[PDB]
Symmetry: D3
Subunit: 61 residues, 6 copies
């Protein structure tokens, strides 16, 4: 199983390590997937490259 996590910049390296740990476990136990088969990708977004309702987060409070 391939898991891609897309989130905004601003997380600690530790939060990222925990994210991978937790997410991998969540997948292992709910899908019966073998652990060495679970891959995780982290993709960080820039507030000026992410919008909702027509407004980029870089243009918001």
């Amino acid at each position: 199983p391939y898991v891609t996590v897309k989130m905004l910049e601003g997380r600690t390296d530790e939060q990222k390590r925990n994210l991978v740990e937790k997410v991998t476990e969540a997948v292992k136990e709910t899908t019966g997937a073998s652990e060495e088969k679970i891959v995780v990708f982290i993709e960080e977004m820039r507030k000026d490259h992410y919008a909702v309702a027509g407004k980029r987060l870089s243009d918001m409070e």
Copy 2:
């Protein structure tokens, strides 16, 4: 945050429900994001559309 889980066809509806649930909690507790801001996409693959070492799974003997 946005989580996309890509895995082979086959999981039961229940397994998928648990995946979404578990994966969402794993994100929530590990990044600080709030539930209504956590989105999960499920993408299923066919054994004949997924290959490793030049061999599609469907062609593995």
Copy 3:
């Protein structure tokens, strides 16, 4: 440029035609790119493959 639009199943063929058209003009007029260089991909999701706050849409009551 490449534009991928991911949305739930349900739109009519007409709606999709308008999406491609409108979205392409929006790109053309806003980035300077030329029409034959603008590509649009449409990706449809199932309510049981899309979740928010740990709940797939198909499971929302």
Copy 4:
């Protein structure tokens, strides 16, 4: 609806803000999607990471 716009580096911050505005509107009116439900991601490509017909744009005039 989730819209990903993949384009080359070289656009102004204003062009990007307009892109998000225009594209969000194009989607709102052609798909009947609620505005606060329309998300836009901008992904910039490097000429040395984008090829056509076997030649990277970084290796062209």
Copy 5:
């Protein structure tokens, strides 16, 4: 490495097998990666879900 090939529906099963094989060798010999570390995903599009210059292929005359 992970290679995703996105193309229109239509290729034969044989063509797909050759794609995976050829593409994998091309990666192996050009990046140094080892075969069991090279993954290929095949994604097929519908002519009515792919557009160029504001015109879906299915609508081209």
Copy 6:
């Protein structure tokens, strides 16, 4: 056809140029796709953003 190659940072600019050449050829001959229709994207991953079996490569030997 659109080919995305996702691999770790650490490859020479030459290896990347060869990758695009080889991969484009592999696709041209196995799918009957016209050369000017074959597009290649290179996406580099950071070891601290790529995990396998719950452990990020940045946390491994």
